[PDB]
Design an enzyme around this catalytic site. Sequence first.
Site, short mmCIF file in Angstrom:
data_model
loop_
_atom_site.label_atom_id
_atom_site.label_comp_id
_atom_site.label_asym_id
_atom_site.label_seq_id
_atom_site.Cartn_x
_atom_site.Cartn_y
_atom_site.Cartn_z
N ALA A 1 -28.29 -35.70 -46.68
CA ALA A 1 -29.20 -36.16 -47.88
C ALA A 1 -30.72 -35.25 -47.02
CB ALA A 1 -29.28 -37.59 -47.72
N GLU A 2 -30.56 -35.61 -45.48
CA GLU A 2 -32.44 -35.88 -44.95
C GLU A 2 -32.12 -34.07 -44.48
OE1 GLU A 2 -33.88 -37.76 -44.98
OE2 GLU A 2 -33.10 -39.97 -43.37
N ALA A 3 -30.59 -33.61 -44.59
CA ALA A 3 -31.04 -31.96 -44.60
C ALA A 3 -31.69 -31.82 -45.72
CB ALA A 3 -29.54 -31.54 -43.97
#
Lengths: 281, 70, 70, 70, 70, 70
Positions: free
Chosen positions: A166-168
């Site tokens: 998700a953060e990537a």
Amino acid sequence: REFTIDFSTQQSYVSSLNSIRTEISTPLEHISQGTTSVSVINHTPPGSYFAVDIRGLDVYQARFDHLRLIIEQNNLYVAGFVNTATNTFYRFSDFTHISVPGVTTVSMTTDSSYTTLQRVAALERSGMQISRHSLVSSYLALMEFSGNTMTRDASRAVLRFVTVTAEALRFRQIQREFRQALSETAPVYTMTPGDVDLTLNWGRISNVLPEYRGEDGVRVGRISFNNISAILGTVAVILNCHECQITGDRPVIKINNTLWESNTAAAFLNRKSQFLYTTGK
Amino acid sequence: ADCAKGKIEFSKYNEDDTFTVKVDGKEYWTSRWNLQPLLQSAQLTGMTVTIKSSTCESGSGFAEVQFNND
Amino acid sequence: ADCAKGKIEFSKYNEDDTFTVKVDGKEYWTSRWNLQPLLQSAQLTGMTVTIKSSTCESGSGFAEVQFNND
Amino acid sequence: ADCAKGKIEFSKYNEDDTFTVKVDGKEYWTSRWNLQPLLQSAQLTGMTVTIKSSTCESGSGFAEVQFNND
Amino acid sequence: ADCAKGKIEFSKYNEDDTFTVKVDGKEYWTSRWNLQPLLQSAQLTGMTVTIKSSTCESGSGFAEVQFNND
Amino acid sequence: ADCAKGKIEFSKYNEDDTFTVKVDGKEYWTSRWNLQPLLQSAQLTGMTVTIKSSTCESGSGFAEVQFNND
Ligand SMILES: CO[C@@H]1O[C@H](CO)[C@H](O[C@H]2O[C@H](CO)[C@H](O)[C@H](O)[C@H]2NC(C)=O)[C@H](O)[C@H]1O
Ligand SMILES: CO[C@@H]1O[C@H](CO)[C@H](O[C@H]2O[C@H](CO)[C@H](O)[C@H](O)[C@H]2NC(C)=O)[C@H](O)[C@H]1O
């Protein structure tokens, strides 16, 4: 909707992320070069999710292949994880509105927040190490997990997987820094204070970037972008702001050819006379 | 009277602890200290300011000012 | 006289409650407390500041400063 | 009473050192010094404020204000 | 001497009228109210701060700090 | 005691010159003058604040607050 994130190589990983981005988002008119952009998540109803099958933890091998992440589409939040061997969806307490058909849903007592996860995991994200080895360990922890309450090792696993999925997806910076861990040299990715700051400012960044029209810089709280390559090298996907709003109704102010989040400017322009402040105890 | 209406062209902290602004080509000063951050904020965010005073000659004092975002 | 004109390169709060700024490669300090947050705002936003003083040697004091936008 | 709720339409520093804001088409003044920069920052970002006072007619005084996230 | 350099990780006002900042994994405090808005503005804008003292140590008082945009 | 840890839902300037914030569904007031701009800055930027006080019921006073980036 089902996607694969393949951790086999840097190529397979980046390709996986790019494929998800193209399907769920649309490039901003003013922050796009070639097919590398800041993109806005396409409007979808609340409750909409996509599945992410985790693959290639052991390079190019059909091993460790029973983990699926459930990601709420509008905000890219991880709603929980599926053990596809047991056909069980372990769902965070703050995602009771996410319904996955054809699985046994276990509603957890634990919420998905970083505050909660870091506490249960006894692991801070700032300085958190992620390697291929620790992702395999994370996988095994999640596959062993049972019950309605997150354990330390399950929480450590979720912290690591949310960062690299998700953060990537949101931040090309995290994609770039983490992907080195997938190389043959198998180095360790260490999450920096700067990485952490990005993830904590995603909503605020999302409100500001659509207003960008080629200004000499962008300032959003602690985040600074000095040029378009800095923007593109850092951010890949933003919320659809058309948690975008904190207070007020003015996304931006242009100050000396820099685009400022209005709230940031307001927060250092609300001081009275210094002599009066200090003497008035 | 409305002495000047427009954006702040420059501001200046003075050796006597007063504060000068240039608005619509004319310079005005104030001795009110709380106007210093209020005027600098207006300058930075591009507020339209209306300087108000009994005397509106360039180089005159003021202690009334209206702030508008637009 | 105009000692230095440019953006604030760094600012520094000093133990004697004075405040230093570096402008155009030269350092200047002020004992005027009111200037502290005003200079910080100028630094944050990249205002062009003009330091005005009778002594323009790096390390000297000032109490007059003009603030300009681009 | 809650007199007016909405964004600040203009603000004004007054000669008696009080400070005026226009909210929901009505003008209100305050003599509370600390409210001056707090209200101006609310104004510049479009923060919704609730003015609270004994009387709600334009020209009324206030010493209480809520800063909302609406 | 330079005690710590980096962005501010958190700030905290204590009941005993001290203001703590965490910089580069170390906590320092000041009771200079002048420094409170300066340090908080540095925190919220992501300035690099350099805590300076004659003697650098954990949990010690300070009254010298440099501010850089980056 | 650890009273509240969250974002400021609203803030209020009170008739007695104290300042109230709503955090985690409870209202807390402070008479600490230094905290007023700091609390508004926290609200503006959606900072997580940690309120600590000897009582944590809504309507309790405080003088200790941490400003977090998370
Ligand atoms: C020869 O005296 C010098 O005058 C300078 C200004 O022309 C500087 O003094 C100014 O700045 C000081 C530090 O802030 C202090 O505030 C003085 O009061 C101020 N002088 C005047 C007249 O306002 C310089 O420091 C002096 O050495
Ligand atoms: C008597 O020594 C003078 O002290 C001044 C302040 O009262 C000036 O020193 C300050 O400004 C400098 C600018 O180059 C530099 O930042 C110093 O570190 C600062 N002093 C202290 C103690 O922090 C003046 O330059 C001195 O000659």
